[PDB]
Every structure is written in C-alpha cells, then in structure tokens.
Amino acid sequence: ADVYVPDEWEVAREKITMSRELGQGSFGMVYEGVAKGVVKDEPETRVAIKTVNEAASMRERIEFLNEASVMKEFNCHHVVRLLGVVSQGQPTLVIMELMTRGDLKSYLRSLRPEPPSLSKMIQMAGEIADGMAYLNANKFVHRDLAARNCMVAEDFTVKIGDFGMTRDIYETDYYRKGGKGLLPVRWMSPESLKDGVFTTYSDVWSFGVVLWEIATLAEQPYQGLSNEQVLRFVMEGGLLDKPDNCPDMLFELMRMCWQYNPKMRPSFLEIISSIKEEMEPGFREVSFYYSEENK
Ligand SMILES: Cc1cc(-n2ccnc2)cc2nc(-c3c(NCc4ccccn4)cc[nH]c3=O)[nH]c12
Numbered sequence: 001a002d003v004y005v006p007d008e009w010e011v012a013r014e015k016i017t018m019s020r021e022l023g024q025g026s027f028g029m030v031y032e033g034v035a036k037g038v039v040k041d042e043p044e045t046r047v048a049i050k051t052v053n054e055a056a057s058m059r060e061r062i063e064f065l066n067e068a069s070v071m072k073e074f075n076c077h078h079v080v081r082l083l084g085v086v087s088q089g090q091p092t093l094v095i096m097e098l099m100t101r102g103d104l105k106s107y108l109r110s111l112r113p114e115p116p117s118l119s120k121m122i123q124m125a126g127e128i129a130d131g132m133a134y135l136n137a138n139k140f141v142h143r144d145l146a147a148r149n150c151m152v153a154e155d156f157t158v159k160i161g162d163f164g165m166t167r168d169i170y171e172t173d174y175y176r177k178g179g180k181g182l183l184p185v186r187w188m189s190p191e192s193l194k195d196g197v198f199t200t201y202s203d204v205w206s207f208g209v210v211l212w213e214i215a216t217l218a219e220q221p222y223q224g225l226s227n228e229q230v231l232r233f234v235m236e237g238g239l240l241d242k243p244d245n246c247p248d249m250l251f252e253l254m255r256m257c258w259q260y261n262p263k264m265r266p267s268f269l270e271i272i273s274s275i276k277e278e279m280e281p282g283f284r285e286v287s288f289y290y291s292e293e294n295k
Contacts, residue, residue: 001087001088001089002058002061002062002065002087002088002089002090002092003087003088004062004065004066004087006087006088007072009069009072009082009084009085010084010085010086010087010088011035011037011038011083011084011085011086011095012086013086013088013089013093015035015037015038016033016034016035016036016047016049016084016086016093016095017033017034017035018031018032018033018049019031019032019033019034020032022048022100022102023102024169025050025051025165026164026165026166026167026168026169027050027051027052027053027056027060027064028050028051028052028053028056029051030048030049030050030051031048031049031051032046032047032048032049032098032100033046033047033048033049034046034047035047035083035084035095038083038084038095039083045083046098047083047095047096047098048095048096048097048098048099049093049094049095049096050064050068050093050094050095050096051091051092051093052064052091054090054091056092061092064092064094065085065087065092065094067164067165068082068085068094068162069082069085070162070163071162073138073140074134074135074138074140076131076134076135076288077130077157077159077286077287077288078127078128078130078131078134078157078158078159078160078286078287078288079131079134079135079159080096080097080099080151080159080160080161080162081096081097082094082095082096082097083095083096083097098154099151099152099153099154099159099161100152100153101151101152101153101154101156102151102152103147103148103149103150103151103152103161103166103169104124104147104148104150104151104152104158104210104213104214104218105146105147105148105150105166105170105213105218106148107152108213108214108217108218109217109218111217112217115217116214118247118249118250119278121211121214121215121247121250122250122275122278122279123158123278123279123280124214125210125211125214125250125253125271125275126272126275126276126278126279126283127157127158127159127283128145128150128158128160128207128210129207129268129271129272129275130268130272130283130287130288130289131159131160131288132145132203132204132207132268133267133268133269133271133272133288133289133294134288135160135203136200136203136267136268137288137293137294141198141199141200141202141203142160142163142198142203142206143163143198143202143203144163144164144167144187144206145160145187145203145206145207145210146173146184146187146206146209146210146213147210147213147214147218148166148169148170148173149161149162149163149164149165149166150210167182172220173186173187173220175227175230177227177231178196179196185227185230185231186209186220186221186222186227186230187205187206187209187221188202188205188206188234189201189202189205189206189262190234190235190236190237190260191262192205193231193234193235194235199262200267201262201263201265202262204257204265204267204268204271205257205258205262207257207268207271208253208254208255208256208257208258209221209240211250211253211254211257212240212243212254215243215246215250215251216243216246219243221240222234222240237260239255239258240254240258242254253271253274253275257271269289269294272287272289273289276289
C-alpha cells in the first residue's frame with residue numbers, strides 16, 4: 001500500500017467507480033465517479049476522484065495524501081469536503097465532494113464576452129466569506145485564498161478549496177521569493193510580503209483580491225506590474241484600481257479588506273453581517289454564520 005497512516009478516512013477501492021475525466025489536477029488527472037457508503041443516508045454518492053501520476057515515488061504519493069488530510073478537520077457547507085482516501089496499494093486516490101464547474105478562476109473567465117449581476121456577486125462573496133469565517137473560527141489560516149483556490153458546484157454554489165492545489169495549473173500566479181519558495185504575491189497582504197507571516201487578517205486581504213477577480217472576471221491583479229514591482233507597490237500602500245463598471249459597494253468592501261493596518265480590516269464575520277440580507281433564503285440553514293457553532 002501507499003502506506004501513510006490509514007485512519008478512519010480510508011475507503012476500500014472496490015467501493016469506488018471512475019466514470020470519466022474531469023481534468024488535470026496538480027498531482028495527476030481528476031475523474032468524476034461514484035463511491036459507495038461515503039455519506040450517511042446515501043448508498044452511493046457522485047464524487048470527484050483525484051489521482052497521482054503513475055510516475056511518482058512513495059514520498060510524492062504520501063505528500064499527495066498528507067496535503068489532502070488537512071481537510072479531514074473541516075465540516076462546512078462552504079468548504080469542499082474530503083470524503084475518503086485510498087492509500088492501500090496503487091493507484092493512490094483521494095475522494096472528494098464533486099464540484100462540476102471546476103475552479104472559480106476558470107469559471108469566471110468562461111463568462112467573458114469574447115457576467116454575474118451584483119446580487120450574484122454578493123452571493124459568491126457571502127459563500128466564500130462563510131467558508132473562510134468557518135476556517136478562521138477553527139484557527140485555520142488559509143494562506144492562499146484566491147479564485148483559483150475556490151470551486152464551483154453544479155448549482156453554482158462557491159466553496160473554499162485547498163491551499164495551493166491549483167498552483168501547478170496557474171503557475172504565473174506564483175513567484176519565487178521569501179526563502180525562495182513559490183508565493184501568490186499578487187494576492188498577499190503588505191505585512192505578509194514583508195515578513196512572510198500569514199494571519200486571518202491577511203486572509204481577509206486576499207478575500208478583497210477575490211472580490212476584485214470576480215468584478216473583473218479574473219483578470220491578473222496588478223496587470224502591467226512585474227512580480228518585483230508588485231512587491232514594492234503593495235508594501236508601500238499601493239492598491240488595485242476599481243474595476244470598470246464595478247458596483248460602488250463592492251469596491252467599498254475591497255477597500256475595507258485592503259486597509260494597510262491589518263487590525264483595521266473587517267473580519268469575515270463582519271463582512272457577512274454586512275451582506276447577510278442579500279444572501280439567498282437557504283443561507284440561514286446551511287451557513288456557518290447562522291449555525292449554533294457560530295457563537
Ligand atoms: C479538474 C476539474 C475540472 C473540472 N472541469 C472541467 C470542465 N469543467 C469543469 C471540474 C473539476 N472538479 C474537480 C474537483 C477537484 N479537483 C481539484 C482541482 C484541481 C485542478 C483544478 C481544479 N480543481 C477537487 C474536488 N472536487 C472536484 O469536483 N476538479 C475538476
């Protein structure tokens with residue numbers, strides 16, 4: 001077996017059926033399929049099946065497994081769910097909640113004329129903020145919040161995905177610096193760019209950039225600035241320009257998230273409270289915000 005430390009998340013491979021490809025993932029191809037007994041009331045569930053290249057060592061396979069194991073601790077409607085792991089023998093698999101529409105950056109670019117209404121943009125923002133508020137409440141700091149790291153469900157619901165996970169696909173969204181490691185510099189707070197430290201406040205900064213991506217259909221932030229120019233611009237108080245035809249209140253939220261002083265930024269909870277009224281009816285029943293765990 002691709003033996004790491006198996007735990008209660010292991011699922012027999014005979015319970016998984018792979019139907020067709022979804023697309024290339026960082027460690028290998030991702031397929032859609034069905035898994036038996038991964039959800040309480042469901043005999044079988046439609047799922048996403050992540051695989052690792054046939055060419056891959058024990059270390060790399062264990063890496064793939066360890067990377068996925070962070071989500072074992074999450075249980076939130078607005079965070080993509082991990083459903084199982086096949087670590088015993090080849091091929092190594094990770095079973096996840098199926099999100100048919102792929103990553104949010106790709107979804108956004110697919111809407112290009114060659115877009116979401118303000119109410120639809122608020123809905124995405126609220127869903128993303130709810131997933132983040134849930135993570136921050138549980139002491140988790142994402143460190144790589146960006147549209148590329150959010151996923152879109154069949155019914156269009158947006159959910160938080162893995163830190164990185166979509167790093168080998170959008171390589172230009174990363175830059176090698178700070179201990180010469182790949183960092184998503186165009187999404188990073190000025191304080192993180194300076195000392196390499198990430199907090200819930202810096203996750204909120206990144207959230208502002210996500211709003212900006214949504215408002216521009218995922219253009220590259222700071223287009224026209226090199227990676228090195230970005231570091232200097234942002235560290236010295238520079239901000240992204242209000243997108244063309246961007247609703248005022250959306251840009252207002254961005255500016256709040258982009259306060260130079262991290263303590264001046266709103267919390268994900270505060271963001272949600274400000275748009276709560278605009279969220280579709282069912283938000284009350286599925287959100288972390290309105291849950292008994294939020295308090
Ligand atoms: C890769 C991909 C492609 C998809 N697609 C093709 C055309 N339209 C959509 C859907 C999809 N859902 C997943 C899932 C995952 N792949 C992680 C990942 C890697 C690279 C890019 C994006 N996401 C994970 C969990 N659930 C998914 O449904 N991955 C995909």
